[PDB]
Design an enzyme around this catalytic site. Structure first.
Site, PDB file in Angstrom:
ATOM      1  N   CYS A 294       0.100   1.698  -3.657  1.00 11.51           N
ATOM      2  CA  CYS A 294       0.744   2.618  -4.634  1.00 11.51           C
ATOM      3  C   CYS A 294      -0.094   2.639  -5.928  1.00 11.51           C
ATOM      4  O   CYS A 294      -0.401   3.728  -6.441  1.00 11.51           O
ATOM      5  CB  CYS A 294       2.216   2.269  -4.866  1.00 11.51           C
ATOM      6  SG  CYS A 294       2.503   0.601  -5.536  1.00 11.51           S
ATOM      7  N   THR A 295      -0.524   1.488  -6.425  1.00 11.41           N
ATOM      8  CA  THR A 295      -1.358   1.377  -7.655  1.00 11.41           C
ATOM      9  C   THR A 295      -2.698   2.096  -7.475  1.00 11.41           C
ATOM     10  O   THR A 295      -3.140   2.789  -8.414  1.00 11.41           O
ATOM     11  CB  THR A 295      -1.493  -0.090  -8.074  1.00 11.41           C
ATOM     12  OG1 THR A 295      -0.148  -0.545  -8.298  1.00 11.41           O
ATOM     13  CG2 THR A 295      -2.328  -0.243  -9.333  1.00 11.41           C
TER      14      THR A 295
ATOM     15  N   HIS B  36       5.115  -2.637 -13.916  1.00 12.36           N
ATOM     16  CA  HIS B  36       5.560  -2.312 -12.565  1.00 12.36           C
ATOM     17  C   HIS B  36       7.038  -2.628 -12.347  1.00 12.36           C
ATOM     18  O   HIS B  36       7.488  -3.693 -12.749  1.00 12.36           O
ATOM     19  CB  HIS B  36       4.649  -3.069 -11.623  1.00 12.36           C
ATOM     20  CG  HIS B  36       4.634  -2.552 -10.235  1.00 12.36           C
ATOM     21  ND1 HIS B  36       5.744  -2.656  -9.405  1.00 12.36           N
ATOM     22  CD2 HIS B  36       3.618  -2.038  -9.496  1.00 12.36           C
ATOM     23  CE1 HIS B  36       5.411  -2.212  -8.210  1.00 12.36           C
ATOM     24  NE2 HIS B  36       4.097  -1.832  -8.225  1.00 12.36           N
TER      25      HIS B  36
ATOM     26  N   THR C 187      10.255  -5.340  -7.000  1.00 11.50           N
ATOM     27  CA  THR C 187      10.138  -4.990  -5.568  1.00 11.50           C
ATOM     28  C   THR C 187      10.824  -6.068  -4.750  1.00 11.50           C
ATOM     29  O   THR C 187      11.195  -7.105  -5.286  1.00 11.50           O
ATOM     30  CB  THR C 187       8.689  -4.856  -5.076  1.00 11.50           C
ATOM     31  OG1 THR C 187       8.104  -6.165  -5.084  1.00 11.50           O
ATOM     32  CG2 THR C 187       7.873  -3.880  -5.898  1.00 11.50           C
TER      33      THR C 187
ATOM     34  N   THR D 103      -2.549  -8.083  -8.748  1.00 11.08           N
ATOM     35  CA  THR D 103      -2.834  -6.874  -7.937  1.00 11.08           C
ATOM     36  C   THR D 103      -4.348  -6.889  -7.725  1.00 11.08           C
ATOM     37  O   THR D 103      -5.059  -7.128  -8.718  1.00 11.08           O
ATOM     38  CB  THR D 103      -2.404  -5.576  -8.647  1.00 11.08           C
ATOM     39  OG1 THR D 103      -3.070  -4.496  -8.003  1.00 11.08           O
ATOM     40  CG2 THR D 103      -2.802  -5.463 -10.106  1.00 11.08           C
ATOM     41  N   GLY D 104      -4.855  -6.672  -6.524  1.00  6.72           N
ATOM     42  CA  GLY D 104      -6.318  -6.496  -6.334  1.00  6.72           C
ATOM     43  C   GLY D 104      -6.756  -5.025  -6.448  1.00  6.72           C
ATOM     44  O   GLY D 104      -7.963  -4.722  -6.119  1.00  6.72           O
TER      45      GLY D 104
END
Ligand SMILES: Nc1ncnc2c1ncn2[C@@H]1O[C@H](COP(=O)(O)OP(=O)(O)O)[C@@H](O)[C@H]1O
Ligand SMILES: Nc1ncnc2c1ncn2[C@@H]1O[C@H](COP(=O)(O)OP(=O)(O)O)[C@@H](O)[C@H]1O
Ligand SMILES: Nc1ncnc2c1ncn2[C@@H]1O[C@H](COP(=O)(O)OP(=O)(O)O)[C@@H](O)[C@H]1O
Ligand SMILES: Nc1ncnc2c1ncn2[C@@H]1O[C@H](COP(=O)(O)OP(=O)(O)O)[C@@H](O)[C@H]1O
Lengths: 329, 329, 329, 329
Positions: free
Chosen positions: D150-151, D177, D180, D208-209
């Site tokens: 999504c990112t 964010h 979740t 997040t990668g």
């Protein structure tokens, strides 16, 4: 003897400032003012959704709050002319109303015998601005000063360390900020579009001048910083997310070591480093202006860095206001 | 032809009422009033945290809102004397300010040529009170009426069914209620102690007279009902939790069947029954005043019952106000 | 000497029970078990979103937690056969897993040398059930008992006072309850429809057998009570909303005076009365099982009453579990 | 004819993907799989806390979901070997389980007659990665691909515009964010310390990668980007906060004009620009991968920029997955 102070404005900052003063021996609260009757003053001081119940007796005798048996004069007047704080012993007024942020307005306190006024927000004129650990050493005994904002007392200490160790070429800040009384509980009229939107059900962009105004406490940063705020549904605790280009190549470890060194020396009690992977609630009622989350520090392409530093936007700033009263007294 | 109405007060109720009027052919919105400039009016009407984006064009031309190309006059005056609603065609004023809840205050609209005023809250005097499906059949053409509260338009339809089928000896109500603009985002001065506390971080007891005031729309319930509210951190949607002693032994199934029968007949469009085990968010933008959760209906010891009925405290009431304008027109 | 206990299951109840034991001199924690590695055990014990940071040192040495310098054995096994609690001195096991709620399952602890097991939830078989202040006087030295639920330890003390002073003919309860780990953060598969729905964005009806099961601790209430739960977006603190028909006419003042009298005598430390108009957050980390909000007490038509009593659904119950270990030891 | 697809994993992404497919004529849903019984599948598909009630009939006939009268096969198996999607007509499998993110695992679908698999997350191996508007033009007909995160489907389109117009030297990203299903409702065991903390009551740093992995879809950005996430208490909608040093001096207006130009041309339906000062809730159920908030765009010292772009982290990505199935079909 302990410096005697009054608080004008018994809101979130005013009541946190009062609780901190009551924990300390080097400062004494002699008077407050708000527009609230005494029954509601007592209730809001005793019970706090964020910081928990005040431990100790909260009583009244007429227009005195009595806290652990000590009498505090309670005024109830919008007009500075009705507030004889100095008649109750006040040497310093902590100006926590948000309504008197020029030297002209604060001059009335000095005229009525107060020795010093500290604004609990950035000045709207050229009132001298001081932030502990950042430019407090330059204080010249001015009668009226601003303690800048909660964000400045986080960003400021972070910039002091980065500037002194590495040099700052340029940077942009986002604060991920707790909602505040400036915001609306449901979609309703406020001073701008975004602030009109339900605070506990949205991410809400809002302005902060904290970054450009760093030129007041660090003139070397004039024209090198801007920032903005993103208000999110937590009741308290915020983070500075600073992205900067430094004057030379650095490593993550070097940046974090510079912060731990300042935490032990020049920024003791002001900046600390979190090496425990805490989250926002863990900093509720934390007195530090900046808590660098060491594991979140990033560097790319030698000189391009990110620092995330927590702040209890209520308690850290309130602790600095009290520190600043003791320091200038 | 469609009844022409004006909305005084463009808050949560006023804006939901306007959206519902724009969905229908049997009523037309000709004017509004608030204390907001037109840019903020447009923004709050177009974008809604709870009910989503208005589908369609929201423009302005001076002091006209233009919605899907139709012009709506926008006043901006606290004073009823500056609001010539009838000059723009208004036959009925929906009084959504919360500030004009006596016949004396509403009389000025009638004096200035409005034919009928409907208060969007319980009257503070003996203004006649009407609730659709409950006592609407008794309407006598009065010029000024109250539509009671959002809670009355849930509790009222529930009581109509229980009274008509079984008889109500006595009962006590709790509403588990969404937070409202009457509450504080953070601990701050409000009209009472509990309302001063952070609304999105607490369960907050608050009063409602909805139950005692049922005597206005169901005189047989005079002295038989009281109630209270527990405000909880949801932005919208509430439940009536009614516990009552009925005049005879009943079963759960009998109670639920009585509600489904009313839902198909005398309370069509007003009360429905949920047999799908929905939760509160599922009733966001639901037009029904009462949604009985059938599986939650309880009976003990023959005559002692509990009914849980949802209501969109914004949309259900707003839908009733619009229904009531069409009905009395 | 202090009774030595072990905690099986280091969840919300298990960790609150451990913090309370560490505050007291009359009980000592010698061992725990969960399915968590030691680094996460330490982190969750030290930092608590709800109850704040543990004051004091939280270290490890292999599979010992070291709290303020005292070693606590940490097991990590789903299987009761690998948990030699008694080898580390445990006389009582606090069964906080939610997974071993029959005498058959708890018998293995007794077989392995534990003297007593207390279930941290209602039994799924006919394990004897005890609630302090309600039927604790009847304890007969049984090896395995249930401490009932958090709701029972609120409703139970309230019913004790009403039954003993006035008599209970019948009643229905709603708990307005904090969300729990039994619920979903976002709409996702759970054990039933309503529990599958986003807990922090809904009012969520859920069952409780607390009321019918009152027959276990107050047999006179067999067949006279039912109840249900409404889960709301607060992280902790809940209320019992009890509506009852009593055996005679009472007044509000009479009901509240009966509660203050029990608070000073037979329910000291168990039930208290709030006369300060607190809200839910004010009871975070409160040890009382029931806090009657005196101003919310209602009576209609002589004998038909409502009582609202707060409970920290984590801390009150945890305090009772610890009290119950000390009592039966 | 419409491409026929199956969804493996009926979670937040799987159910949003199904709703979008049902709105379109160019793709048809023939089968799903989860580990849920059919009654719960129907309930979670029909009612959505975030995206509202599905408009239309949601029924079942055995192990067929029937949506607006069309039958969809429902499997219920953890094992890819029991999922004969191709037997029900599926040409493309949308892999929404989070559990099969290598070509080796997805190969079983191809072996059983599926023509293409699209992973609904970054691959854990060197599966080719495609993002619409970013590198989709380079697609070579591969059988198995990742649609990234999504990112990526927000950051990716933003970087495409900045790179193509100005050039990116280096940058660091923070996503603010929504919480979740990877997070905990209350403080409880999760895969790491910070994810163990109550999601709706904290700001929670998480990795997040997305930024380093931009090298997969924009190789020119290899070694030039890193990022991190700050999870905040909103149920849905997130923002990319990108701070970058560009290859030349730019203005705010120039940056925003470049985004509006891409919005009208190469990124039509993918990136849009918000000029209405919306907040996060206004983008709930928005199909755009990136919504640049034009007024938040900042530049300091010629080449040092910040871009804030919203994304419905559920709906934008789901819309891209469906777009990607149609495109590769
Ligand atoms: N002119 C004034 N005189 C006295 N009190 C004032 C005046 N203006 C504002 N206040 C008070 O100042 C306080 C501001 O507090 P609050 O809204 O919680 O914000 P903050 O976060 O800055 O403390 C409130 O108690 C308000 O009533
Ligand atoms: N005297 C007045 N004249 C005009 N508008 C008013 C007046 N008093 C209040 N209002 C408006 O009425 C609205 C009340 O709305 P809100 O606070 O959202 O509550 P509600 O839930 O009852 O709609 C606000 O827009 C407020 O500005
Ligand atoms: N069989 C088991 N053995 C050990 N620990 C268990 C077992 N089953 C569950 N647990 C633990 O018990 C705890 C339950 O806690 P939590 O979910 O927070 O709920 P509660 O509100 O009842 O404390 C968790 O730490 C869980 O991992
Ligand atoms: N091996 C599997 N086979 C089938 N369904 C699975 C498998 N693993 C996970 N799932 C399902 O995939 C879905 C993941 O959804 P969710 O947790 O809401 O997250 P996301 O945000 O990625 O959609 C859930 O319905 C889960 O039950």
């Amino acid at each position: 003897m302990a410096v005697k102070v009054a608080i004008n404005g018994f809101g979130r900052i005013g009541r946190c400032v009062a609780r901190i003063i009551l924990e300390r021996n080097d400062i004494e609260l002699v008077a407050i003012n708000d527009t609230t009757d005494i029954e509601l003053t007592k209730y809001l001081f005793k019970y706090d959704t964020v910081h928990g119940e005040f431990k100790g007796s909260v009583d009244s005798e007429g227009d005195d709050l009595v806290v652990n048996g000590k009498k505090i004069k309670v005024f109830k007047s919008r007009n500075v002319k009705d507030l004889d704080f100095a008649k109750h012993g006040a040497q310093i007024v902590l100006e926590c109303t948000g309504a008197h942020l020029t030297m002209a307005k604060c001059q009335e306190f000095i005229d009525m015998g107060v020795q010093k006024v500290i604004m609990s927000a950035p000045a709207k004129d050229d009132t001298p601005t001081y932030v502990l650990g950042v430019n407090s050493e330059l204080y010249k005994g001015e009668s009226i000063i601003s303690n800048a904002s909660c964000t400045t007392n986080c960003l400021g200490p972070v910039c002091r360390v980065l500037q002194d160790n590495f040099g700052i070429e340029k940077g942009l800040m986002t604060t991920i900020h707790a909602y505040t009384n400036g915001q609306s509980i449901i979609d309703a009229k406020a001073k701008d579009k975004r602030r009109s939107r339900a605070a506990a059900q949205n991410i809400i962009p809002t302005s902060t001048g904290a970054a450009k105004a760093m030129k007041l406490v660090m003139p070397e940063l004039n024209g090198k910083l801007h920032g903005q705020s993103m208000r999110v549904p937590v009741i308290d605790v915020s983070s500075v997310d600073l992205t900067a280009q430094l004057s030379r190549k650095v490593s993550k470890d070097e940046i974090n070591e510079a912060f731990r060194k300042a935490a032990a020396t020049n920024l003791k009690g002001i900046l600390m480093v979190d090496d425990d992977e805490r989250v926002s609630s863990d900093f509720i009622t934390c007195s530090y202006g900046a808590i660098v989350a060491s594991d979140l520090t990033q560097v790319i392409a030698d000189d391009f860095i990110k620092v995330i530093a927590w702040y209890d936007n209520e308690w850290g700033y309130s602790s600095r206001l009290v520190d600043m009263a003791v320091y200038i007294a």
